Structures are given as structure tokens and as C-alpha cells.
Design a protein that fits this description.
The chain is an alpha/beta fold and 490 residues long. It is built from 15 helices and 10 strands. It has helices spanning 27-39, 51-54, 65-76, 104-112, 145-159, 161-165, 206-218, 252-279, 304-309, 321-328, 354-367, 383-393, 418-421, 423-436, 465-468; strands at residues 9-12, 44-50, 80-86, 117-119, 125-130, 169-174, 286-291, 333-336, 371-375, 410-413. Strands 1-2-3-6-7-8-9-10 form an 8-stranded parallel barrel, surrounded by 4 helices. Helix 5 packs parallel to helix 8 and helix 12 (383-393) runs parallel beside helix 14. The radius of gyration is 22 Å and the shape is globular. The two termini are 23 Å apart. 47% of the residues are buried. The site of a molecule of 2 linked components (BGC-GLC) has 7 residues, from loops. Pfam families: Glyco_hydro_14 (PF01373). It is an enzyme of class 3 (hydrolase). Its EC number is 3.2.1.2. Substrate binds at residues 48, 88, 96, 290, 295, 337, 376-377, 415.
């Protein structure tokens, strides 16, 4: 049956649907929009559950009331929900039209200890997320950063228990860094970064610097220092000593640093996911993390932008499959957030390969036998964008005999706005939804298309770092069709 080819579609809700004062501002307005989505066959919606709004007053001072009202409305509108545990700030990244800082009480501690923030070589502190350096430092009124995240998710589970039991929440997206993505804030617009700048390493806070120094000492090179020839945010790779041909990134010193830098993210994610598995154990939901799509400079040997973000990906070293393998022990979903771009849409001087990057990441995930989901990186309303998303959703097209050999677990569309609802735009979006559903009508029971969700099982045993890194072995991607067999153009 064709339903086996069905890929669910979710729509992101506006940022700030619940304001900084923890108030569900316009219920009636959202309702009408939500009903529009329901009639269009949309499967569900995605929302940020902002740490800065909920635990604002103080440690463990949670107020879940506004979010309970929101979930109630979504449920009433016949939609499922993807809940993001947003432990980051809204404001300094593209599209952030509202300002939502992390909890003030955490920022107060940051006033006396500036090193709890990601820091660049110049010493600029980025306050949008707590550095991985303090994940296990008990400096937040007795708790470590990971315990804060853990306590938050547990409180969410217990306070939204009725919604979880009724099957409203489809998956929990665990925020692991800037914009909720597992990465370093290497391209901060708030510090002047501009596409296609290579970005900057963010390992200069005292905790990470100390860890690095101890690490190189144990490696027999106590004199090694953090990169000091990597240039600045808006530089191009060839103008730096670190990324130029035969540069530092290829020396023993450089390879050690890059391995150390990227391993911190793998462990950061693995440790917090452990806490997430415990908090939602037994619940009928799946866990997911977000991986950013850094396509600029992907076409040059150095992959500079990926490297500064923490993805140690080179033409001869797969820096994404290790993440996918890590996720397998948690039975988690890899949500890749750059699914709509085509290489030709990028300026030539950016050496951008979003199409190839997508193929590499998705293939790596299917290779490791984990579920892969996606999302468009920038707002798009045109058919070419939707057609590219549909292609990536089912790389080899639909199968009339049974399930397609390759398919994504779901796609989340950014974002709900008045522009999307405009007659012509919404008309195209409806066709997009239809094609994602493989020409089938909206299907309320996920079991029908083999998406039944069972109780969350405890994570499998810890996988040693050396085993995760075996996944760095380059592999050929799965074959992609030149264009989808389910085009919106009709
Ligand atoms: O509301 C979810 C999320 O949206 C934005 O982050 C997006 C970003 O805009 C995309 O380009 C891509 O990177 O995926 C991100 C994660 O979904 C907000 O900036 C972020 O704060 C927010 O959590
Ligand atoms: O900010 C991260 C995103 O940067 C680029 O997006 C640019 C886009 O290329 C440019 O035309 C527009 O004016 O600004 C946006 C925002 O910087 C990348 O193309 C995206 O993949 C990144 O997510």
C-alpha cells in the first residue's frame, strides 16, 4: 500500500508564542492558524519550550502553566507535537525576531564567572548557551549544567504527564547548543559574522582551555597551545595559517586539537541524552537532536566552517557518522536542519555544497540504522524548495510494491507565519504536504505507515570513544535521484 511511503510533515510555531513573561499571548489567533494547518493535512507542529521563561525566578522555580494552555490548544486542534527542550537564547541568530535569554539567575552567576560562556580567542563571551566546559562543574548553586538540564526535563515529564500519556507529544528535541543544535556558536551574527565567513573556534573559556592543556600534556606535548593562526569570523580559509594548504589543520598538533574539539561535542551530547533517556523512560515518545547544515566551504579540502563549528568532517574523515552512531545507543533521531538548498542557489565564491552534505549526513544515518529527520534552514515558499525537500525525503522515490528502501522519518517546516497562510503560498504548501504524504490523504494513525511509537526504552550500553570514531571511515553515499518522482509542480 502507498501509505508505507508516507513521510509526516510538521510546522514550527512562531517564536514567542509564549512571551518572556510566561504568558500565552494570543490563543484565539493561534487557534485559527492551527485549524488552517489541520485542514491542510499537516501532521503536527513543533515548539520551543524555553528554559529562560520557565525556570526564570530561580533554581527549580518552574511555571508550566502557559505551556499547559498551549499544549491543550494544540491537542484540541488535532495536531501532534514535537517539543524542544530549549536551553538556549533566542535573539542573536537568523530569524530570531524576539529576545529570550537564558534564566536571569544563571546570567547573574555569569557576572562573577564569565567563563561559563563560550569564548572566542579575542575574549568575547557569548551568552546564548553555557559552554560544554561547565557540563559537570557544580557551580550553579550546587548543581552542574547537566543536572540543571536533567531536572528541567524531569519536571516537564511529570507536569505534562497527561499530555504524554494521551499521545500528544511525538518526540522530544533535546537542545544541545546555539539555536538548540549540537555545535559550537562559530558563526555568531551578534559578533559580526557574515556568510560565508569561516567562523571562529570557541574553545577559549578557562575550563576548556585547562582541559586542552591537560590533554596535550598527557599526549607528550605540554607546549601545544590552542589555535592562534585560524584568522577571524569573516576570513576565507586561504588567508589563514590554520586552514591554508599544508596548514596547521593537517599537522599533528592541528589534528589533535580538532579531534579534542569535536570529541567534546560527542560527549556533551551523549551525556545529556543519557539524562533525557532517564527522564522520559517509559513514555511513548522518541528523542531527537539537531545537527546544523554548514554547507559553505564544503567543496574545499579544509571544510573550514564545519571544523570551527565542531564537525570534524574532511574528504577523508566522516565527522557526521560518529554522531549518528552515538545516537543509536539512545535510539534517537538525527534531525538535520538544512534540507531545502541546491548548490546552484549559492554564490560561487562560498564553495557551497548543501546537496552533497545532505547526501553524506542522511546516508551516514541510514548506514548506522538510525532514524533521520530534517528541516529547511531558511524560509522558502517556492516549488523548487519544496521539490528539493521531497527529493531528500525519499531519495529513490516511492515504491508501489511496499515501503521505499530509503525514507526520512519526518520533516519539520520553518515556520508558521502570515506569509505562509497567504492564499498563493498556502496553495503551494498544501501540494507539498500532499506529495510528502505520497498523494495519500492525511493519516491520523501513525501505525498505518509504520510509525507506531512504543514506550521509550533505557539507552543501550555506553559506546567507547574509539568505537564511535571508527565511524569516521569514509563511505560512498546512497544513490540519489536527479529529481523527485513526486513533484509539486502540477
Ligand atoms: O524554533 C526552533 C529554532 O529555530 C531557529 O533555529 C533554526 C535556524 O533558524 C535554522 O536555520 C536551522 O539552523 O535550524 C535551527 C533549529 O531549528 C531559532 O534560531 C532557534 O532559537 C529555535 O530554537
Ligand atoms: O546564519 C546562518 C545561515 O547563513 C546562511 O544564510 C544566509 C543566506 O545565505 C543569505 O543569502 C541571507 O542574506 O542571510 C542568511 C543568514 O545568514 C546560510 O546559507 C545558511 O545555511 C545558514 O543557516
Amino acid at each position: 500500500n502507498m501509505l508505507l511511503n508516507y513521510v509526516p510533515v510538521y510546522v514550527m510555531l512562531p517564536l514567542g508564542v509564549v512571551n518572556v513573561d510566561n504568558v500565552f499571548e494570543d490563543p484565539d489567533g493561534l487557534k485559527e492558524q492551527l485549524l488552517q494547518l489541520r485542514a491542510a493535512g499537516v501532521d503536527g507542529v513543533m515548539v520551543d519550550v524555553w528554559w529562560g521563561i520557565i525556570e526564570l525566578k530561580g533554581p527549580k522555580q518552574y511555571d508550566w502553566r502557559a505551556y499547559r494552555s498551549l499544549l491543550q490548544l494544540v491537542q484540541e486542534c488535532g495536531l501532534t507535537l514535537q517539543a524542544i527542550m530549549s536551553f538556549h537564547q533566542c535573539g542573536g541568530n537568523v530569524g530570531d525576531i524576539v529576545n529570550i535569554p537564558i534564566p536571569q539567575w544563571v546570567l547573574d552567576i555569569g557576572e562573577s564567572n564569565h567563563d561559563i560562556f563560550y569564548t572566542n580567542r579575542s575574549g568575547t563571551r557569548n551568552k546564548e548557551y553555557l559552554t560544554v566546559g561547565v557540563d559537570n562543574e557544580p557551580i550553579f548553586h550546587g548543581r552542574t549544567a547537566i543536572e540543571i538540564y536533567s531536572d528541567y526535563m524531569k519536571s516537564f515529564r511529570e507536569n505534562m504527564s497527561d499530555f504524554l500519556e494521551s499521545g500528544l507529544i511525538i518526540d522530544i528535541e533535546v537542545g544541545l547548543g546555539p539555536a538548540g543544535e549540537l555545535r559550537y556558536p562559530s558563526y555568531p551574527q551578534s559578533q559580526g559574522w557574515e556568510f560565508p565567513g569561516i567562523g571562529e573556534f570557541q574553545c577559549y573559556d578557562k575550563y576548556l582551555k585547562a582541559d586542552f592543556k591537560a590533554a596535550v600534556a598527557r599526549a607528550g606535548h605540554p607546549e601545544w597551545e590552542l589555535p592562534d593562526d585560524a584568522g577571524k569570523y569573516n576570513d576565507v580559509p586561504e588567508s589563514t595559517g590554520f586552514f591554508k594548504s599544508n596548514g596547521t589543520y593537517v599537522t599533528e598538533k592541528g589534528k589533535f586539537f580538532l579531534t579534542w574539539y569535536s570529541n567534546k561535542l560527542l560527549n556533551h551530547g551523549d551525556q545529556i541524552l543519557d539524562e533525557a533517556n532517564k527522564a522520559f523512560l517509559g513514555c511513548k515518545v522518541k528523542l531527537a537532536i539537531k545537527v546544523s547544515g554548514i554547507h559553505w566551504w564544503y567543496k574545499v579540502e579544509n571544510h573550514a566552517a564545519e571544523l570551527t563549528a565542531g564537525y570534524y568532517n574532511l574528504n577523508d574523515r566522516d565527522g557526521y557518522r560518529p554522531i549518528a552512531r552515538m545516537l543509536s545507543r539512545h535510539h534517537a533521531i538525527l534531525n538535520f536542519t538544512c534540507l531545502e538548498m541546491r548548490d546552484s542557489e549559492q554564490p560561487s565564491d562560498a564553495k557551497s555544497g548543501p546537496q552533497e552534505l545532505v547526501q553524506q549526513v542522511l546516508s551516514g544515518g541510514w548506514r548506522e540504522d538510525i532514524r533521520v529527520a530534517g528541516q529547511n534552514a531558511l524560509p522558502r515558499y517556492d516549488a523548487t524548495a519544496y521539490n528539493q525537500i521531497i527529493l531528500n525525503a525519499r531519495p529513490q522515490g516511492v515504491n508501489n510494491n511496499g515501503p521505499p528502501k530509503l525514507s526520512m522519518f519526518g520533516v519539520t517546516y520553518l515556520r508558521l507565519s502570515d506569509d505562509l497562510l497567504q492564499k498563493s503560498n498556502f496553495n503551494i504548501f498544501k501540494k507539498f504536504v500532499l506529495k510528502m504524504h505520497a498523494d495519500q490523504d492525511y493519516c491520523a494513525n501513525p501505525q498505518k505507515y509504520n510509525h507506531a511509537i512504543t514506550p521509550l526504552k533505557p539507552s543501550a550500553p555506553k559506546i567507547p570513544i574509539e568505537v564511535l570514531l571508527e565511524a569516521t571511515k569514509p563511505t560512498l553515499p546512497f544513490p540519489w535521484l536527479p529529481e523527485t518522482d513526486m513533484k509539486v509542480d502540477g
